[PDB]
Design a binder for these strands. Structure first.
Ligand code: K
Ligand code: K
Ligand code: MG
Ligand code: MG
Ligand code: MG
Ligand code: MG
Ligand code: MG
Ligand code: MG
Ligand code: MG
Ligand code: MG
Ligand code: MG
Ligand code: MG
Lengths: 353, 158, 98, 193, 52
RNA sequence: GAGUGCGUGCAAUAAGUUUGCUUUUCUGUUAUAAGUAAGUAGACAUAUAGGUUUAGAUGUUAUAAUAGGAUCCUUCGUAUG
RNA sequence: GUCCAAAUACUUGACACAUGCUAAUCGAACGUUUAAUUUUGGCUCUUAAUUAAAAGUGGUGUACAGGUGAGUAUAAUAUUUUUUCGCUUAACUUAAAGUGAAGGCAAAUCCUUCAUAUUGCAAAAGGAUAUCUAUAUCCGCUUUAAGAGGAUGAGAAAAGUUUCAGAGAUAGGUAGUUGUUAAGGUCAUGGCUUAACAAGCCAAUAAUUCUCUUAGUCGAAGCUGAAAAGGCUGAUCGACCACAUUGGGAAUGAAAAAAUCC
């Protein structure tokens, strides 16, 4: 079906070593049939393998497989992945994740729940948002499921930042608004993103990921940054069409989001307890991270919706903003000087850069 | 309720003559009279038959006339029993071990059969109690490891 | 699978059916378990009747057929209709009114 | 006695009806001068017109009687058909504050779903929405995100006659082996030598 | 069925069919058995009566 | 002298095949051993972070005993002489 | 030798066979490919899909139906009548309960295993269609209790029946073989099984074994006689047995009951 996983672009020598180890001992054996794979991990066939090593046609020249001590020879997959991931400072360095995560999916390697949230951060802080979105769309091969509530909260954050980067320019904002809709449709329609872990996180929040106020505020942010610019017939039709979504999403978020409830109180009190689900929000450094854009969204949406003559929505949106702004200020007095949280919030809400 | 008593049904009585005796314990060959009808010749022919009759107390000598009854199964080839002696041969009837009545013979089967079930119920219970103690011992070694490992965690949370 | 079905007997252009109780996977005209009744497809006409009506002669043992139906016997389409007319079962097909 | 059913938008004329049931029945389209001749002609009259073999005739009488009862095939309900083509669109709703009920409706190609009334917004039976924007259903070619169309294809409603794959179960081996001897000849004799 | 002894209506179209068919097999067995039993009794009496 | 769709003895023998003082091998429980590969648990800390660290309760790997099933050989065994 | 209807129609070489046909079916079990159609990403190449055809993987059925009479010489764990019983996880009826979790193949209702299933052994599989401004059905799957059916257990006991080809030779056959004691097994009975003793059991007119010749068996089924427990045949009809070029074999399955398979 798909081409054999391969890594042929490495800037550093440590990167290649980490991948070649995982590739030739954890990924390559998965391309073998079931029978021949129960031989490499046996001692009774060690002597036979040395005489006739197994071969597999991998892009021409066949491969070779000798005895592999399951306990000793096998490498630590989590550690290596971390080493390989940390040593990535190039476009081609991050292009190997599609193959790396694909190999682990073939080996049935239960990866850390938080790994998906980490790969999104490091890969997005270098300018490779597409590589992550390409894997999220190609979830049948890479296995980049949107299981964790954090991963979706980390993905939408960078999506907005890339649009907020260039002062919410219409060309990128239009493209960025498509990425959010691409995800909200995947979480809802696609089934590959649904797992037992996600069911537990939805039962604790009582909101499905596609109807979660925290994630629905990102779509209302870009939608509010489009009507602002305009509120040339072809472009005038888009503006009038963006005002309908704004009023629609503005009236859809107010219903879900209760009255005067901040981020740390929106969900049930039993969601923040467990560390495997929705505990990152507790820390002040991480709350301001996902509370900056969502806060500015309400402020920017309450204004425009107020110019069109919608009293109720104005007060409603301001209600949430007032409750979120207060909580945000609280965490701003505890975040240690130098943390990314304090910086991001200061540059977005503080308008200082 | 758990014991199956014998049928204890009476059957026809046949008068025969002991042919052989003393060759095997509690068994004699008696010769009875019969008749078979030839359909082609429309004529009855004498069809005498010889069976192996069960002699419980070995009270029959070759030559005497006896009365036998069928339906009493004691062996593979034996389905007849001695009801009484018509005419003795050699010695009087009063000089031979008495012939047990059919009731006495049947009672032996029931008593022997009932005793057999008593042995089974004991063997089944003992075998079950002997296997439930080995299955309860696995729980012991398995329950201590769990409690020894589960309480370790419980103590690191207070 | 006990089945209430028709065994075709007669000559060319003279069909005469015989209601039987036989196992599904058996020859059509093999000796069945029971012969409930007989069926004549060609409709007859009363001897001294000039009106023009027609009828079909069917000799059926209702009592015996009922027992077999109660133990899981599966009558065929043709026999099911006949039983419906007598009122033992509900019609398997009905004319559309619209 | 032989009541005639009014033509349906998806089946305006006879050529369409005969084209949907396939089985190469569009050869006798000219035999029927009007739409009432199809539903008025009898077996004997279909035998003289030239409707043969008997399998095609009995098959037509069946679909005929099946049309009077409104047991239409795929696309029968459709009301907004245009020159043999219809368009499907997704009609979103709100069953709850966190769910959404999507239904495959049939509306004019130009109009929008939200620009139609309840009476003019039919729900095509047999077509379901899988995911947030995919219309899934037999003979549903996609045009845009959330838009599909049904072209009137020959054999739309036909009941395919089972065809033996390769000579059948009894003769499968012979046909394959006998065809394997005709291949090794071209490879060796006609081409090799 | 338990749902039929509690006075509950049929769940759907098919349930109505099964209820009717199963009931047709219930009255067909009762009449069949009782009907055939009378035949036997009526037959045995004739033999005994005519044999005595 | 010629033939033989016949019986039978011996030798031989494909498929198949009784038995185990056979030849490998998988699985199942039972008891141990390991915690490095995996997987499942708990403890501590970090922050554009997600690291350190111990543990076997399910399960994973290793050995032992034991049960069963495939293989190899053995015996019987068409053709054939 | 004018016509019509019905019913019969290789009785011989089970000799050799050209050609087309006699068992397939389900897309509401499952994905694979190929085409178009619509989309992503990068600037034709490349993702994610829909649809339609073509080959398959699966489930069920080819254990029914139809054909032939080569081989086959029988009394046998064969058969009735009454009494008493046993087994049956597939299909057919009625009802109840349960339908969760992983791995392997491209995927699966295919394979492998796990949790739970009155105590403890011992299960399963998912697919499809509607309603609302998640819920309820549909077709299945597993287990359990019964009815029916069954090709079922050596069923058992009592009393009976079964016209068994023709010719020739053979006086021994039987070794758990016959019986007793004890125990197990069984619904029950039976060397059914085992231990220990005893030397029995069947038969003498052929029990038993052997060779030759011939044959599918049977029925008011066909023909025939006034009739005989009539005679002959063993076509079409029904039942039973055997076989599918000849010979030698096993598995699958509820059950070989195949024109299968080796
Ligand atoms: K030999
Ligand atoms: K023959
Ligand atoms: Mg040899
Ligand atoms: Mg380790
Ligand atoms: Mg030989
Ligand atoms: Mg012939
Ligand atoms: Mg057959
Ligand atoms: Mg399930
Ligand atoms: Mg009598
Ligand atoms: Mg014996
Ligand atoms: Mg012959
Ligand atoms: Mg014959």
């Amino acid at each position: 079906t798909y081409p054999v996983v391969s890594f042929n672009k490495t800037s550093s020598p440590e990167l290649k070593e980490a991948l070649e180890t995982l590739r030739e001992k954890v990924i390559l054996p998965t391309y073998l049939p079931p029978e021949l794979r129960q031989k490499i991990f046996n001692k009774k066939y060690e002597k036979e393998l040395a005489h006739d090593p197994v071969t597999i046609q991998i892009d021409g020249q066949p491969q070779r497989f000798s005895y592999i001590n399951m306990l000793t020879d096998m490498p630590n997959t989590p550690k290596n992945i971390r080493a390989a991931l940390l040593s990535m400072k190039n476009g081609g360095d991050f292009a190997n994740l599609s193959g790396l995560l694909e190999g682990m999916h073939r080996a049935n390697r239960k990866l850390p729940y938080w790994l998906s949230a980490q790969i999104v951060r490091k890969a997005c802080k270098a300018g490779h948002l597409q590589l992550i979105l390409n894997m999220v769309r190609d979830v049948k091969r890479t296995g980049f499921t949107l299981e964790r509530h954090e991963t979706v909260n980390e993905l939408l954050f960078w999506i907005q930042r890339f649009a907020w980067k260039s002062d919410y320019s219409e060309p990128e904002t239009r493209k960025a608004l498509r990425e959010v809709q691409e995800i909200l449709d995947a979480l809802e329609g696609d089934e590959r993103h649904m797992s037992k872990d996600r069911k537990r996180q939805q039962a604790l929040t009582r909101f499905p990921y596609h109807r979660d106020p925290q994630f629905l505020a990102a779509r209302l942010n870009l939608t509010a940054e489009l009507a602002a610019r305009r509120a040339t017939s072809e472009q005038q039709l888009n503006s009038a069409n963006d005002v309908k979504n704004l009023v629609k999403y503005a009236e859809q978020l107010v219903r879900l989001w209760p009255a005067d409830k901040a981020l740390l109180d929106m969900y049930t009190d039993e969601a923040y307890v467990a560390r495997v689900d929705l505990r990152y929000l507790i820390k002040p450094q991480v709350h301001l991270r996902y509370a900056s854009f969502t806060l500015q969204a309400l402020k920017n949406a309450a204004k425009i919706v107020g110019q069109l003559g919608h009293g109720p929505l104005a007060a409603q949106l301001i209600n949430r903003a007032a409750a979120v702004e207060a909580e945000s200020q609280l965490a701003y007095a505890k975040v240690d000087d130098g943390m990314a949280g304090q910086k991001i919030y200061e540059m977005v809400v503080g308008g200082k850069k | 309720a758990a014991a199956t008593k014998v049928s204890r049904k009476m059957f026809r009585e046949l008068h025969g003559v002991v042919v052989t005796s003393g060759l095997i314990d509690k068994t004699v060959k008696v010769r009875v009279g019969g008749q078979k009808f030839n359909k082609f010749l429309q004529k009855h022919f004498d069809d005498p038959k010889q069976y192996l009759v069960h002699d419980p107390n070995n009270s029959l000598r070759a030559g005497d006339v006896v009365a036998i009854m069928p339906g009493f199964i004691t062996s593979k080839s034996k389905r007849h029993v001695v009801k009484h002696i018509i005419a003795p041969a050699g010695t009087p009837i009063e000089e031979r071990p008495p012939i047990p009545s059919l009731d006495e013979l049947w009672d032996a089967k029931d008593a022997a059969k009932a005793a057999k079930k008593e042995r089974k119920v004991l063997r089944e219970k003992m075998q079950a109690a002997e296997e439930a103690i080995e299955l309860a011992e696995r729980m012991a070694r398995h329950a201590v490891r769990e409690i020894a490992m589960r309480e370790k965690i419980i103590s690191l949370q207070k | 699978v006990l089945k209430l079905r028709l065994a075709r007997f007669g000559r060319t252009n003279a069909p005469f059916y015989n209601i039987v109780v036989a196992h599904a996977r058996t020859a059509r005209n093999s000796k069945p378990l029971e012969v409930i009744g007989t069926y004549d497809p060609v409709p007859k006409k009363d001897t001294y009747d000039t009106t023009g009506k027609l009828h079909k002669d069917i000799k059926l043992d209702v009592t015996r057929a009922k027992y077999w139906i109660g133990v899981g016997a599966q009558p065929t389409d043709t026999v099911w209709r006949l039983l419906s007319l007598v009122g033992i079962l509900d019609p398997k097909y009905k004319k559309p009114q619209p | 006695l032989p009541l005639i059913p009014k033509p349906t938008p998806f089946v305006p004329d006879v050529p369409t009806f005969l084209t949907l049931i396939g089985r190469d029945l569009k050869q006798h389209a000219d035999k029927f001068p009007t739409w009432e001749a199809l539903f008025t002609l009898t077996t004997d009259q279909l035998r003289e017109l030239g409707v043969e073999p008997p399998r095609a005739r009995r098959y037509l009488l069946r679909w005929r009687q099946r049309f009077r009862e409104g047991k239409f095939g795929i696309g029968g309900d459709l009301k907004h058909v245009e020159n043999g083509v219809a368009y499907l669109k997704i009609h979103e709703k709100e069953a709850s504050p966190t769910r959404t009920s999507r239904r495959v409706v049939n509306v004019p190609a130009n109009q929008h779903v939200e620009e139609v009334s309840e009476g003019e917004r039919v729900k095509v039976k047999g077509y379901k929405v899988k995911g947030v924007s995919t219309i899934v259903g037999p003979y549903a070619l996609p045009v845009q995100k959330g838009v599909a169309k049904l072209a009137v294809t020959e054999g739309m409603w036909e009941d395919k006659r089972g065809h033996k794959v390769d000579g059948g179960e009894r003769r499968r081996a012979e046909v394959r082996f006998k065809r394997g001897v005709a291949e090794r000849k071209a490879l060796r004799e006609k081409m090799g030598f | 069925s338990a749902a039929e002894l509690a006075g509950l209506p049929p769940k759907s179209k098919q349930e109505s069919w099964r209820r009717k068919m199963a009931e047709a097999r219930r009255q067909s067995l009762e009449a069949g058995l009782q009907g055939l039993w009378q035949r036997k009794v009526k037959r045995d009496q004739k033999q005994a009566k005519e044999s005595k």
